[PDB]
Enzyme design. Sequence first.
Site, PDB file in Angstrom:
ATOM      1  N   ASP A 143      -6.157 -29.099  -1.633  1.00 11.98           N
ATOM      2  CA  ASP A 143      -6.544 -30.032  -0.549  1.00 11.98           C
ATOM      3  C   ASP A 143      -8.107 -29.894  -0.122  1.00 11.98           C
ATOM      4  OD1 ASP A 143      -5.983 -31.129   2.145  1.00 11.98           O
ATOM      5  OD2 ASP A 143      -6.757 -29.166   2.711  1.00 11.98           O
ATOM      6  N   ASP A 170      -4.391 -25.852   3.956  1.00 11.28           N
ATOM      7  CA  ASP A 170      -4.671 -25.141   5.401  1.00 11.28           C
ATOM      8  C   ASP A 170      -4.030 -25.982   6.468  1.00 11.28           C
ATOM      9  OD1 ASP A 170      -7.830 -26.325   6.692  1.00 11.28           O
ATOM     10  OD2 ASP A 170      -6.299 -27.263   5.187  1.00 11.28           O
ATOM     11  N   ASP A 197       0.023 -30.212   4.156  1.00  8.68           N
ATOM     12  CA  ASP A 197       0.144 -29.352   2.867  1.00  8.68           C
ATOM     13  C   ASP A 197       1.357 -28.445   2.847  1.00  8.68           C
ATOM     14  OD1 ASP A 197      -2.399 -30.270   2.258  1.00  8.68           O
ATOM     15  OD2 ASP A 197      -3.268 -28.673   2.990  1.00  8.68           O
TER      16      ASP A 197
HETATM   17  N1  LIG Z   1      -6.824 -37.001  15.105  1.00  8.94           N
HETATM   18  C1  LIG Z   1      -7.079 -38.159  14.188  1.00  8.94           C
HETATM   19  N2  LIG Z   1      -7.149 -39.316  14.979  1.00  8.94           N
HETATM   20  C2  LIG Z   1      -7.143 -40.303  14.289  1.00  8.94           C
HETATM   21  N3  LIG Z   1      -7.206 -40.596  12.787  1.00  8.94           N
HETATM   22  C3  LIG Z   1      -7.353 -39.275  12.272  1.00  8.94           C
HETATM   23  C4  LIG Z   1      -7.115 -37.926  13.121  1.00  8.94           C
HETATM   24  N4  LIG Z   1      -7.312 -36.874  12.140  1.00  8.94           N
HETATM   25  C5  LIG Z   1      -7.335 -37.618  10.666  1.00  8.94           C
HETATM   26  N5  LIG Z   1      -7.515 -38.940  10.870  1.00  8.94           N
HETATM   27  C6  LIG Z   1      -7.833 -40.081  10.045  1.00  8.94           C
HETATM   28  O1  LIG Z   1      -6.535 -40.013   9.225  1.00  8.94           O
HETATM   29  C7  LIG Z   1      -6.733 -39.895   8.114  1.00  8.94           C
HETATM   30  C8  LIG Z   1      -5.320 -39.348   7.154  1.00  8.94           C
HETATM   31  O2  LIG Z   1      -5.309 -37.972   7.788  1.00  8.94           O
HETATM   32  P1  LIG Z   1      -4.683 -36.797   6.611  1.00  8.94           P
HETATM   33  O3  LIG Z   1      -4.530 -35.451   7.530  1.00  8.94           O
HETATM   34  O4  LIG Z   1      -3.411 -37.142   5.775  1.00  8.94           O
HETATM   35  O5  LIG Z   1      -5.824 -36.293   6.120  1.00  8.94           O
HETATM   36  P2  LIG Z   1      -7.306 -35.587   6.246  1.00  8.94           P
HETATM   37  O6  LIG Z   1      -8.381 -36.421   5.429  1.00  8.94           O
HETATM   38  O7  LIG Z   1      -7.788 -35.579   7.816  1.00  8.94           O
HETATM   39  C9  LIG Z   1      -7.126 -34.091   5.611  1.00  8.94           C
HETATM   40  P3  LIG Z   1      -7.167 -33.473   4.170  1.00  8.94           P
HETATM   41  O8  LIG Z   1      -8.575 -33.557   3.466  1.00  8.94           O
HETATM   42  O9  LIG Z   1      -6.923 -31.933   4.054  1.00  8.94           O
HETATM   43  O10 LIG Z   1      -6.271 -34.266   3.433  1.00  8.94           O
HETATM   44  C10 LIG Z   1      -8.160 -38.834   7.821  1.00  8.94           C
HETATM   45  O11 LIG Z   1      -8.821 -39.151   6.747  1.00  8.94           O
HETATM   46  C11 LIG Z   1      -8.870 -39.738   8.788  1.00  8.94           C
HETATM   47  O12 LIG Z   1      -9.461 -40.884   8.692  1.00  8.94           O
HETATM   48 CA   LIG Z   2      -6.835 -29.755   5.317  1.00  4.35          CA
END
Ligand SMILES: Nc1ncnc2c1ncn2[C@@H]1O[C@H](COP(=O)(O)OP(=O)(O)CP(=O)(O)O)[C@@H](O)[C@H]1O
Ligand SMILES: [Ca+2]
Length: 994
Positions: A351, A703, A707
């Site tokens: 991740d 984390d 995941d």
């Molecule tokens: N609390 C929130 N409110 C709105 N959009 C959010 C959010 N948290 C994350 N996002 C958006 O949603 C997208 C998808 O989230 P997801 O949790 O699947 O990935 P992530 O990119 O935050 C985590 P990681 O890199 O571990 O996969 C994020 O890339 C961000 O654009």
């Molecule tokens: Ca993460």
Amino acid sequence: MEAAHSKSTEECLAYFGVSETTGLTPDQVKRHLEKYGHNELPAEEGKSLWELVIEQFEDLLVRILLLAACISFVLAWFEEGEETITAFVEPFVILLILIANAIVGVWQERNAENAIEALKEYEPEMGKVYRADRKSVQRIKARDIVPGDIVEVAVGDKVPADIRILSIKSTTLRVDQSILTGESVSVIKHTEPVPDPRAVNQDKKNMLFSGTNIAAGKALGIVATTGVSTEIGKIRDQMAATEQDKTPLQQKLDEFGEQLSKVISLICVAVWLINIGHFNDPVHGGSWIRGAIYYFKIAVALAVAAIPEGLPAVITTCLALGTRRMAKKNAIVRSLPSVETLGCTSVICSDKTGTLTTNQMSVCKMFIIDKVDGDFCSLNEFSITGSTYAPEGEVLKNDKPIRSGQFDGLVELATICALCNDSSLDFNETKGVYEKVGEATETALTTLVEKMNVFNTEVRNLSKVERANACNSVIRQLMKKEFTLEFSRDRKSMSVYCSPAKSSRAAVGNKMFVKGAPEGVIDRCNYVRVGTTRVPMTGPVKEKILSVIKEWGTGRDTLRCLALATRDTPPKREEMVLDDSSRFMEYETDLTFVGVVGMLDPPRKEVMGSIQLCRDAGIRVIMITGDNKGTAIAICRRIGIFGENEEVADRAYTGREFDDLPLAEQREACRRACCFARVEPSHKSKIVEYLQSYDEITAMTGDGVNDAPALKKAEIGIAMGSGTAVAKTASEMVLADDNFSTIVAAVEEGRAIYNNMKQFIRYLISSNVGEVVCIFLTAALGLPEALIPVQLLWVNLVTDGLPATALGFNPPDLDIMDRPPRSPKEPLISGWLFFRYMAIGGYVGAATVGAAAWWFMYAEDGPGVTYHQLTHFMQCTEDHPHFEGLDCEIFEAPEPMTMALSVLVTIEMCNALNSLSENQSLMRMPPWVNIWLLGSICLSMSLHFLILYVDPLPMIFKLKALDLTQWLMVLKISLPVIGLDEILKFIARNYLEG
Ligand SMILES: Nc1ncnc2c1ncn2[C@@H]1O[C@H](COP(=O)(O)OP(=O)(O)CP(=O)(O)O)[C@@H](O)[C@H]1O
Ligand SMILES: [Ca+2]
Ligand SMILES: [Ca+2]
Ligand SMILES: [Ca+2]
Ligand SMILES: [K+]
């Protein structure tokens, strides 16, 4: 203590005399501690009793040697055995080696438990509470939680105490209670009383149990019970060993030892029959029983000698050792097989956010619209200083610090960041640092808001505790948050429905404030806010916005970006159904775009290195993330997954591009691609599953709750110490360090354990084959006997104990992390290695027979029977088939026998020196790379001298050998066995294969 899921929410607050939103006063917390103690279990102690541990005599090859001793203790009680006391010695030449190995294993086990308990106790578990001394929520040690205080829990959290739910902030609340109720899938909660006092836990649907995990949602509760009164507290001791079985490699070596029993058995029954003839010989009076009992004793001793009685302990040990070594690197092993499995992993899925990256977010750039005029669109961009969560920094436009309130767009932008946000900041008074409560991405917006201070709120005169949420609170005072549409990874955005505060203007309009992944959000905007103004979204405006997002995410800062929007005219609340999360996206449509924020989120220092090491060890590393593909490819480049210019058109995929592929093509993509982006949790699991379909050993690192499925699917799931309790629950390892380097170390440790198990087997086989080759080589060639039951028992005690066990403390091979991973279904014993067990076993067989012969012949002190042995042993008493009757009996001289016994010990200790490395020479891997081995060898050689020279002993085992010149030959016959393996090692080294 409150006895009720069955009282109301009001009654619970009133029971404890607490204001729902403020939490307990300092004095209340004082009393409650006194009256209820600290929120922790007393236990924390015991586990495996010293004696409980000692009992690994429970194994297999150990029970054999065990019984064997019984019989040598019973044959000895019948006044005989051949020599009186020599038969009571027997039962102890057997137990001794068992006792030695037992002590080592027990010691290793103890040190292991300790190291782990040390590491687990290190980092203190925290909880979130509202307490009267602070306006915003605060984090406290979980053990300081008392009945009566307002606790906050959200997706990912471990529930800290038995809690009666007060308020569900999200539209649902789902919980993982498997640890307590066996309920495999998460379960829904409410805040309504459950009338029934005797209710079973599964029906406590308004309660959260300590030790369970919030699977989804956010809730506010009041703690009912803590510590031992806790629902999981009551049930600690109980449960009939939910502790599992043994590891693959363990069941393998076990199975392997299983079939060695059969073979040795047969060879033994054989030895008995082969010699059923010498049954009448004068030596045992020729009694029609005394002869078969003796050879039965010869077989049994040969058996105890052939059986690798130590194999069971050495696995247990190398295991306990790997766990201890990992603990020292701050890795917690939750599952024994994980180090060995990691040992032969070919693929590490990983991740990005919080795993590959530090997850220390700071908003460093932002923009809103400036001008819109036909095909012309201009943005107002801004920068923001401060990298930490501290509300300390500046908003810069054109290198001058500006007053955010000056820009109506920033006012709205900060308004959204403040309202559409489930997190906050808490100032740690002891560490002196602002810490997040909740998710980093969200907290980054919180600190942004504090920095923007758009309403020019006076904050200079506030304590560090108050300064943390001051401007956010100001915004909160200005709009009432009716409810929130929780973030969800399908829509990749999050919403809040709000009305104007004082209700003074109860229709100046309701709003929704939206934030999310820019692509989804920008698509659902039809307007673009320009200052306080609004104009239609167009192609040019959208292309503008998107390209600056592309710029930021791909530039040298690799910014994680979010879009912020408002729905100017939201549906009526009544037309809105909160039940199905799947209708939230439609509610979040017809949006007005407000602005974008770009976040900094540095890669961990040790990652780029770790990846190179994986690459060298033939291990592939794949990044898997929900983040935008642009930023993800950029990051991959920064950390070495991709080269800085590498074309990646078919080596990187969004979830959508991946779904657009046929199944066959998806499987393939997983074999070549190393970056998967904008993928959901189901995607993560699928990718891992695909890798496994190539019968590969896959690891997953993560984390967050997105995941957990992949973490459970992998062969080894590795969670970050900083991550969610949900991720940890689904894992076999936890990096308390958050140190990605440890993964590579674990791989190497697991690789080394296998290699040590190997050399251990090579040592026991090639040597014990030798001993057996001896008994058959003399008895076939027609010679005097080489050894006696007790003499057998002695080369056993001395060559099959600690010198063997010690190989488990072998150093890793020189190239251990430079070969590729062993396929897990590799025959335990290679075709070539078996030939090596024989070439060595053969020299040992023929060197120990040549020694006893040389005494009879070429030995001056011995008779000069001269080549041909004079042929037979037909003489016996006084002058028989008279062929130079010069000597009467000689054979039955301890000398020729003691001779063989000493080439045996010596030559075995010699080729244990060959077992420091599979194919490396004693040249590159000298004897002193394993000191533990050299000590054991000295222990045996010295023990063997004792037996020979301490006057009462040589009688029991058979008289001594001339120090000066006898040993010179033993050492002359033995040393070559090193030369022989060293040719063999060279063969498989200079020609290589495996
Ligand atoms: N609390 C929130 N409110 C709105 N959009 C959010 C959010 N948290 C994350 N996002 C958006 O949603 C997208 C998808 O989230 P997801 O949790 O699947 O990935 P992530 O990119 O935050 C985590 P990681 O890199 O571990 O996969 C994020 O890339 C961000 O654009
Ligand atoms: Ca993460
Ligand atoms: Ca043995
Ligand atoms: Ca042996
Ligand atoms: K797993």
